[PDB]
Amino acid sequence: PPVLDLGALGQDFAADPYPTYARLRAEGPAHRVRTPEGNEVWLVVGYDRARAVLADPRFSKDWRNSTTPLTEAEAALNHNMLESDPPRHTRLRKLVAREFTMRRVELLRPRVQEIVDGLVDAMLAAPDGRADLMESLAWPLPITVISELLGVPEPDRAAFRVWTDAFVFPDDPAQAQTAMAEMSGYLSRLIDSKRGQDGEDLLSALVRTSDEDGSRLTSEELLGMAHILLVAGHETTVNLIANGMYALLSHPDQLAALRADMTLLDGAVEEMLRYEGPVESATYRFPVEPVDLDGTVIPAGDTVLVVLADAHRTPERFPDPHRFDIRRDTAGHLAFGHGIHFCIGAPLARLEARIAVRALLERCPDLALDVSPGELVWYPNPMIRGLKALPIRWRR
Ligand code: HEM
Ligand SMILES: C[C@@H]1C[C@H](N(C)C)[C@@H](O)[C@H](OC2CCCCCCCCCCCC2)O1
């Protein structure tokens, strides 16, 4: 079977990838494709097989197992738990697990509520009663929360944001490299700036751990840890909030049901993850040996992407999959992954999204989508399902 070119689609494919994936899934679990940016990878589609591959230790996350070359700017940032296997994965994650439990995250609630209250205050001063929800709330909220956790000073954040866009959503390869190089230079200086300042933010704590014992946390791993916690804080929750509010505003009967009973809110947020989560495909996996998936054999070291999005539209697992239904049974969705790499930030992402959504509904009378769905534009990245903008309006 020939390599399918996703780039050739466009677009189209970036707005609505689902039929493309579902067509693949009818033929079987694994497919050689060429991403819009030009990388040859495997797609794993279909819920059951997606779930198994996510947790299967025959599929490594360590780039030493991959046959794909890394540039210097890329390699400098890959000593992090998401790009590791046990035992390194185990050791790195244990260093921060305690910061991200539900009970520790619950203590951030007053401060997350305050950040939301202020962003919405400012949004609602708009004289025309219109805004882009992404500029006004979905982007600044997660950024502010994770910046204050890690200790990124406020004046540094705007630059920081440009980099983390420039290489999550490139448009030009040399720019992505430059940004990675700069982000890495910045994080090193930030890290150095904490030494001997007795700060109590998370990065100051990790700096002390590393300086007390460089075999528990190396300086490369310390930079990798600040990087992964910050980027994940920049680019996932944003899209959960935007995509989810889009789902609600474009399914007016679900929005009303939720208005009528706000106790449905937690279950509505799960169905946002299930129906249109920010993660369209999981991060790279590399088979340590060749892996046979129903007669399709995947060679050692090839790149494998597990397609979360298609898993979530598998009718056998989620009946009536294309329906956004806030009361659906969402248990078992893969929006936060599955297995040893299951999202460490999930309690924090849920806290943010629940608060932001409830603030929008309670505070925006007759909240409306301010363009038709057909006018929205989706970024092309096949790992991310994300809008460029979400125009909303409300009654002023
Ligand atoms: C709605 C928001 C989020 C979604 C949908 C999400 C999704 C995911 C997924 C699918 C994975 C597993 C990747 C894989 O196995 O290939 C993951 C891992 C990870 N996420 Fe989240 N994420 C979100 C928010 C966050 C936040 C706010 C943080 C910051 C604390 C975070 C930090 C991480 C880290 C460090 C990992 C690697 C965990 C490991 O390897 O053990 N994520 N995320
Ligand atoms: C480690 C990988 C490398 C990749 N490129 C440099 C090739 C980058 O775009 C990706 O991160 C994106 C993709 C979203 C996946 C969601 C998982 C959330 C965990 C944090 C990873 C960064 C998130 C953004 O992180």
**CATH number, domain with residue 6:** 1.10.630.10
Experimental method: X-ray
Three-state DSSP state, 3: coil
Nearest ligand 1 atom to the CA of 142 is 27
| CB distance 352 to ligand 2 below 6 Å | no
Element (H, E) at 33: strand 30-34
- Residue 337, Cβ density class (10 Å: 0-12 exposed, 13-18 middle, ≥19 buried): buried
Give yes or no for a contact between 352 and 289, defined as CB atoms under 8 angstroms apart: no
Residue 384 CA, ligand 2 centroid: distance in Å: 9
Q: In 3D, which of 147, 154, 103 has the Cα closest to residue 237?
A: 147
Inter-CA distances, 144 with 109, 115, 118, 267, 349, Å: 13, 8, 12, 25, 13
Q: In 3D, which of 199, 202, 198, 187 has the Cα closest to residue 99?
A: 202
Residue 374 amino acid letter: G
Q: In 3D, which of 295, 336, 292, 291 has the Cα closest to residue 312?
A: 336
Pairwise CA distance, residues 235 & 256, whole Å: 29
Q: Which two tokens stand for residue 15?
A: 């707005």
Nearest ligand 1 atom to the CA of 284 is 16
Residue 232 amino acid letter: A
Nearest CA to ligand 2 atom 3: 283
- What is the residue range of 9's domain? 1-396
| CB distance 225 to ligand 1 below 6 Å | no
Q: Any idea which residue has 């954040």 for tokens?
A: 157
Q: Is 48 left (phi over 0), alpha (psi -120 to 50) or beta?
A: alpha
Give yes or no for a contact between 203 and 191, defined as CB atoms under 8 angstroms apart: yes
Pairwise CA distance, residues 145 & 150, whole Å: 9
- Residue 276, Cβ density class (10 Å: 0-12 exposed, 13-18 middle, ≥19 buried): buried
What separation, in Å, do the N-terminal and C-terminal C-alpha atoms of the chain show?
57
Pocket mutation for ligand 2, best pick of 93, 229, 383 (most atoms within 8 Å of C-beta): 383
Residue 282 CA, ligand 1 centroid: distance in Å: 10
Pocket mutation for ligand 1, best pick of 101, 108, 149, 236 (most atoms within 8 Å of C-beta): 236
Pairwise CA distance, residues 85 & 80, whole Å: 10
Nearest ligand 1 atom to the CA of 350 is 1
| CB distance 229 to ligand 1 below 6 Å | yes
What is the total count of domains within the chain? 1
| CB distance 230 to ligand 2 below 6 Å | no
DSSP readout, 245-285? Answer: HHHHHH-HHHHHHHHH-GGGHHHHHHHHHHHH-SBSSPPPB
Three-state DSSP state, 385: coil
Closest ligand to the CA of 63? 2
Residues in the chain: 396
Inter-CA distances, 331 with 105, 111, 218, 267, 325, Å: 22, 29, 38, 10, 13
Nearest ligand 1 atom to the CA of 279 is 5
Three-state DSSP state, 199: coil
Residues after which the chain is broken (C–N above 2.5 A) are none
